[PDB]
């Protein structure tokens, strides 16, 4: 009962804490500057416990004179994965990010982002008088809100933690859903680009002030940055390097490929028509209303289609092991078209061809080879589970 | 690479399976019958693997002559927990359910469901000529979409598994959010009630046909049912009893109490005004726009307020142990108002009184007693974690 009073109070306090933490980037029009503002907080994990908050204040303004889109209030939701290159000796950061715009119910610059776009990033920094430089390269694919970059400190040892520079180191690569296209400032300013300025306040420590020019140089999207950091504590979490660094990337890549089977027109979203096409190809013929009911359950932004992050969340929504086992039993039954307990090379071929894969008979045979443990030329349920687990 | 082809194909097949399974109750108007229809599938777990599907077809029609509400298409989402009474020797089922209506963007009978309502359930059944009876009693609170019932087989051993009778054994207790009040058929038909008829098809087995009268008898909501089952297999999953039976209920009760601290007017939903009130009481003063941003992140139905199931999902959204540990560190800091590392009886009192609890100084002291391991009269961080973990 005293225990119950503590728990109930504890839960209420913890609820406020969960409601209170949003790391989303909140964007508003700044009509006087013909651009936008944003504000957001980043929570950096401290090694062996604690969070280091970083309060961001952002403004963006067009470089060029052409008209730009000024948005209604909305936000960007980002998921970042930081990693290392095992064959890299230089101080470095490998980065994978997916960003999508949301927060709103229901340009010529956008044509520049229909496919994969090469990116170069250059940063010249000075933190408490420690000068440093970073260069990065990779690619953006705004269809999926996706960025893939590697960064190198070109001046030796980076004097601050890599995660503190992530937000500084191309919001033009955000995926803005179809109903929000008129609110995408960042692409509207292209190719001439925009200036992005921030102040980033590290609580109980110093701050960064940043100015960047984001624009096309040829077919490359370039982010050239100046950063000045002042007032940092020599044994704070930043100059003292006390911050933590970091689905796998392999896993996400598999899910993207799987997503691509549904997203027939490659626009980064699955429609009821696309889902129906795939289901019909495997012999199931739900009605339009049934297909919408299915999409609705996983359609977190309520725009009526499934984007890749929503697909990801569905496929990452962890299950009871016993549900996981039954889902694999069900998938086996889909592959085993005649129900005899064995997936044949003909059956495998049929499922892959219908989902939209193109494979030779020889490639289908190699798939059976990897799975076929007892050498009968087919894949039974035990062998299927081993392939899938 | 063959491994990758299997995985990517497997994921696509498993995605269709996840999209395809919806156990939601889909409701449509049946204007010719002055009532509604529904259809849905229930997935019953089979002991040691497999699912037994049960396809439901439902119609409801008013008993009385008064006008009723006929809805636009929507659905009910339910979460059920089945349990046993340790001091019960009779064949029985204890049941806890939360049901909420959804699927739509943005009556006098409803007045009968503003508080807790007693429920009686009576079922007379015949499955493959095995006659049986069930009686149940409990309470519904439609404010939270909540049902709490205990059922007893009054004829001895139940000849079918309890989980197969759940849907048969009061959708008037569903929580219809404010924007959907005009689509709540079930309460609109009260007090005179409605007739609910189903056929339930157990795949590869027999079926139940059911007819029920749901109505008020005095202040009690009564569900009186006739069930006939035919064509069941003697060693199928139903007559062979091969189905599985079953947050804890304690846990959910704690979360409800915590929810109640926010839901000041007891209407079962937390508004920005309510959340602001609680946050202000603990010293934080977010703006209306900030409070809406907070609610939006957890507001799965997009109606702008947090209902109890949404609160539950937020508080059940499992975390990395290290995030869990930091959330407890943060909660400690909230209780420790002067930051000295110790929660005093005065500080505890202040937090509870401000959240809206009413406690005597003696009750606050007993809380400190349970937590205070080293007898200094206050609660340090180590003691707090033990109380909270
Ligand atoms: Ca598409
Ligand atoms: Ca969507
Ligand atoms: Ca076969
Ligand atoms: Ca084999
Ligand atoms: Ca309320
Ligand atoms: Ca809501
Ligand atoms: Ca204190
Ligand atoms: Ca103590």
CATH of the domain at B162: 2.40.155.10
Q: What is the DSSP letter of B243?
A: B
One-character DSSP codes across B135-192: EEEEEEETTTTEEEEEEEETTSS-SS-GGGGTTT--GGGSB--GGGGGG-HHHHTTTT
Answer yes or no: are the C-beta atoms of A210 and A134 closer than 8 Å. no
Burial code (b: 16+ CB inside 10 Å, e: under 16) for B50-69 equals ebbebebebbbbbeeeeebb
Residues A233, A301 within the same domain = no
Q: What is the DSSP letter of B277?
A: H
* Closest listed residue to residue A357, CA positions, set A348, A365, A366: A348
Query: Would you tell me which residues 241-270 of chain B have a C-beta closer than 8 angstroms to some C-beta of chain A?
Result: 254-255, 257-258, 261-262
> B51 and A24 in contact by Cβ < 8 A?
no
Distance of CA A256 to the CA centre of its chain: 11
CB neighbours of B305 closer than 8 A, spacing ≥ 6? Answer: B177, B178, B269, B270, B271, B272, B295, B299
Torsional class of B24: left (φ above 0), alpha (ψ -120 to 50), beta (otherwise) = beta
For residue A134, the number of C-alpha atoms closer than 13 Å in the C-beta half-sphere is: 29
Q: What angle do CA A354, A357, A361 make, to 5 degrees?
A: 90
* Test mutation, B10, B53, B333, chain A, max A CBs within 10 A: B10
Token duo for residue A272: 């009821």
Token duo for residue A45: 């994990």
Answer yes or no: are the C-beta atoms of B19 and A294 closer than 8 Å. yes
Q: Provide the 10 A C-beta neighbour count for residue A265.
A: 10
Answer yes or no: are the C-beta atoms of B359 and B352 closer than 8 Å. yes
Q: Does A2 touch chain B (CB under 8 A)?
A: yes
How far apart are alpha carbons B199 and B210 in whole angstroms? 6
> A11 and B49 in contact by Cβ < 8 A?
no
Answer yes or no: are the C-beta atoms of B118 and B221 closer than 8 Å. yes
* Closest listed residue to residue B147, CA positions, set B62, B74, B193, B79: B79
HEC profile of chain A: CHHHHHHHHHHHHHHHHHHHCCCCEEEEEEHHHCEEEEEEEEEEEECCCCEEEEEEEEEEEECCCCCCCCCCCEEEEEEEEEECCCCCCCCEEEEEEEEEEECCCCCHHHHHHCCCEEEEEEEEEEECCEEEEEEEEEEEECCCCEEEEEEEECCCCCCCCHHHHCCCCCHHHCECCHHHHHHCHHHHCCCCCEEEEEEEEECCCCEEEEEEEEEEECCEEEEEEEEEEECCCCCCCCCCCCECCCCCHHHHHHHHHHHHHHCCCCCCEECHHHHHHHHHHCCCCCCHHHHHHHHHHHCCCCCCCEEHHHHHHHHHCCCCHHHHHHHHHHHHHHHCCCCCCEECHHHHHHHHHHHCCCCCHHHHHHHHHHHCCCCCCCEEHHHHHHHHC
Residues B112, B224 within the same domain = yes
* Closest listed residue to residue B5, CA positions, set A315, A383, A371, A319: A371
Question: To the nearest 5 percent, what fractions of chain B are helix, strand and coil?
Answer: 35, 30, 35
Chain A residues whose CB is inside 8 A of the B296 CB are 103
Token duo for residue B17: 């399976």
Torsional class of B223: left (φ above 0), alpha (ψ -120 to 50), beta (otherwise) = beta
Q: What angle do CA B305, B35, A298 make, to 5 degrees?
A: 40
Minimum-distance CB partner of A294 among B20, B255, B315 = B20
Residues A16, A88 within the same domain = yes
- Between the alpha carbon of residue B31 and those of residues A2, B107, B210, the distances in Å are 54, 18, 21
Query: Would you tell me which residues 303-362 of chain B have a C-beta closer than 8 angstroms to some C-beta of chain A?
Result: 311, 314-315, 317, 322, 325-331, 334-335, 351-352, 355, 357, 359
Q: Does B53 touch chain A (CB under 8 A)?
A: no
Residues A198, A329 within the same domain = no
Answer yes or no: are the C-beta atoms of A242 and A227 closer than 8 Å. no
One-character DSSP codes across B84-102: --TT--SSEEEEEEEEEEE
Please state whether beta strands B117-127 and B220-230 pair in parallel, antiparallel, or not at all (unpaired). parallel
Residues A166, A252 within the same domain = no
How far apart are alpha carbons A287 and A126 in whole angstroms? 61
- Between the alpha carbon of residue B78 and those of residues A86, B39, B145, B300, the distances in Å are 49, 14, 9, 15
* Test mutation, A4, A16, A304, chain B, max B CBs within 10 A: A16
How far apart are alpha carbons A165 and A142 in whole angstroms? 21
HEC profile of A78-132: EEEEEECCCCCCCCEEEEEEEEEEECCCCCHHHHHHCCCEEEEEEEEEEECCEEE
Answer yes or no: are the C-beta atoms of B304 and B179 closer than 8 Å. no
Answer yes or no: are the C-beta atoms of B29 and B62 closer than 8 Å. no
- Between the alpha carbon of residue A296 and those of residues A291, A302, B299, the distances in Å are 9, 7, 15
One-character DSSP codes across B56-74: EEEEEEESSSS----PPSE
Structural domain count of chain B: 2
**Residue given tokens 């110093």 in the structure block:** A206
Distance from CA of A382 to the nearest CA of B (A): 15
Minimum-distance CB partner of A10 among B20, B262, B388 = B388
**Residue given tokens 């010293």 in the structure block:** B283
* Closest listed residue to residue A286, CA positions, set B370, B287, B112, B22: B22
Segment (H or E) for B246: none
How far apart are alpha carbons A366 and A383 in whole angstroms? 14
Q: What angle do CA B162, B167, B172 make, to 5 degrees?
A: 135
Q: Provide the 10 A C-beta neighbour count for residue A187.
A: 24
In three-state secondary structure terms, B80 is strand
Residues B257, B237 within the same domain = no
Task: List, in sequence order, every residue forming a beta bridge with A220; answer none if it has no partner.
Answer: A217
Q: Does A48 touch chain B (CB under 8 A)?
A: no
Solved with: X-ray
Among chain B residues, CA nearest to A353: B9
Chain A residues whose CB is inside 8 A of the B388 CB are 6-7, 10
For residue B308, the domain's CATH number is: 1.10.238.10
The data reach a resolution, in angstroms, of: 1.9
Minimum-distance CB partner of B50 among A103, A326, A371 = A326
* Final residue of a structural domain among B226, B247, B268: B247
* Final residue of a structural domain among A209, A231, A247: A247
**Residue given tokens 């957001």 in the structure block:** A40
* Final residue of a structural domain among B190, B221, B247: B247
Q: What is the DSSP letter of B31?
A: G
Token duo for residue B180: 């959907």
* Closest listed residue to residue B15, CA positions, set A333, A262, A268, A356: A262
* Closest listed residue to residue A376, CA positions, set A328, A333, A344, A329: A344
How far apart are alpha carbons B259 and A15 in whole angstroms? 9
Residues B9, B117 within the same domain = yes
Residues A216, A276 within the same domain = no
Q: Provide the 10 A C-beta neighbour count for residue B306.
A: 29
Q: What angle do CA A297, A303, A307 make, to 5 degrees?
A: 75
- Between the alpha carbon of residue B375 and those of residues A105, B222, B345, B379, B383, the distances in Å are 55, 54, 13, 9, 11
CB neighbours of B181 closer than 8 A, spacing ≥ 6? Answer: B107, B110
Query: Would you tell me which residues 57-116 of chain A have a C-beta closer than 8 angstroms to some C-beta of chain B?
Result: 75, 103, 105
* Closest listed residue to residue A194, CA positions, set A107, A134, A136, A75: A107
Residues B155, B8 within the same domain = yes
Token duo for residue B278: 């609680």
Distance from CA of B172 to the nearest CA of A (A): 23
Segment (H or E) for B119: strand B117-127
Residues B217, B145 within the same domain = yes
Residues B275, B236 within the same domain = no
Token duo for residue B40: 């849905």
Neighbours of ion ligand 6 (CB under 5 A): B 299, 301, 303
- Between the alpha carbon of residue B364 and those of residues A335, B155, B370, B372, the distances in Å are 62, 50, 10, 12
Minimum-distance CB partner of B293 among A18, A22, A297 = A22
In three-state secondary structure terms, B280 is helix
Q: Provide the 10 A C-beta neighbour count for residue A61.
A: 16
In three-state secondary structure terms, B207 is strand
Please state whether beta strands A220-230 and A117-127 pair in parallel, antiparallel, or not at all (unpaired). parallel
- Between the alpha carbon of residue A101 and those of residues A76, A98, A220, B285, B356, the distances in Å are 4, 11, 23, 27, 38
Answer yes or no: are the C-beta atoms of B201 and B54 closer than 8 Å. yes
Among chain B residues, CA nearest to A40: B290
Please state whether beta strands B269-270 and B306-307 pair in parallel, antiparallel, or not at all (unpaired). antiparallel
One-character DSSP codes across B339-386: -SSEE-HHHHHHHHHHHT----HHHHHHHHHHH-SSSSSSEEHHHHHH
Answer yes or no: are the C-beta atoms of A226 and A212 closer than 8 Å. yes
Chain B residues whose CB is inside 8 A of the A311 CB are 15
Enclosing domain of residue B32: 1-247
How far apart are alpha carbons A148 and A139 in whole angstroms? 6
Q: How many CB pairs under 8 A join A and B?
A: 191
Residues B151, B297 within the same domain = no
């Amino acid at each position: 009962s005293s225990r119950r009073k503590w728990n109930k109070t504890g839960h209420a306090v913890r609820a406020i804490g969960r409601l209170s933490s949003l790391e989303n980037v909140y964007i508003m029009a700044d009509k006087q500057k013909n651009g936008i503002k944003a504000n957001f907080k980043i929570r950096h994990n401290i090694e062996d416990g604690g969070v280091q908050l970083a309060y961001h204040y952002q403004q963006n303004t067009p470089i060029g004179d052409g008209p730009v889109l000024l948005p209604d209030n909305h936000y960007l939701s980002t998921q970042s994965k930081l990693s290392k290159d095992p064959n890299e000796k230089r101080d470095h950061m490998v980065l994978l990010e997916f960003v999508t715009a949301a927060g709103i119910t229901l340009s010529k610059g956008e044509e520049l982002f229909t496919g994969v776009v090469p990116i170069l990033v250059e940063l010249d920094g000075d933190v408490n008088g420690h000068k440093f430089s970073v260069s990065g390269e990779g690619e953006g694919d705004a269809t999926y809100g996706k960025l893939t970059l590697k960064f190198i400190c070109t001046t030796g040892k980076l004097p601050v933690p890599w995660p503190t520079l992530v937000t500084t180191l191309v919001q033009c690569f955000s995926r803005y859903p179809d109903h929000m296209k008129q609110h995408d400032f960042f692409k509207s300013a292209m190719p001439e680009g925009y200036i992005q300025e921030r102040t980033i306040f590290f609580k109980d420590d110093g701050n960064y002030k940043t100015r960047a020019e984001v624009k096309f140089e040829g077919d490359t999207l370039v982010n050239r940055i100046e950063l000045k950091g002042i007032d940092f504590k020599e044994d704070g979490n930043i100059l003292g390097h006390k911050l933590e660094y970091n689905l796998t990337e392999e896993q996400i890549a598999e899910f993207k490929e799987a997503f691509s089977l549904f997203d027939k027109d490659g626009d980064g979203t699955i429609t009821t028509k696309e889902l129906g096409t795939v289901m019909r190809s495997l012999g199931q013929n739900p009605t339009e209303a049934e297909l919408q009911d299915m999409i609705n359950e996983v359609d977190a932004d309520g725009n009526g289609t499934i984007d890749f992050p929503e697909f990801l969340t569905m496929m990452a929504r962890k299950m009871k092991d016993t549900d996981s086992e039954e889902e694999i039993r069900e998938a086996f039954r889909v592959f085993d078209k005649d129900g005899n307990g064995y997936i044949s090379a003909a059956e495998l071929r049929h499922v892959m061809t219908n989902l939209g894969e193109k494979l030779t008979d020889e490639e289908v045979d190699e798939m059976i080879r990897e799975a076929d443990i007892d050498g009968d030329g087919q894949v039974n349920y035990e062998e299927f589970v081993q392939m899938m687990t």
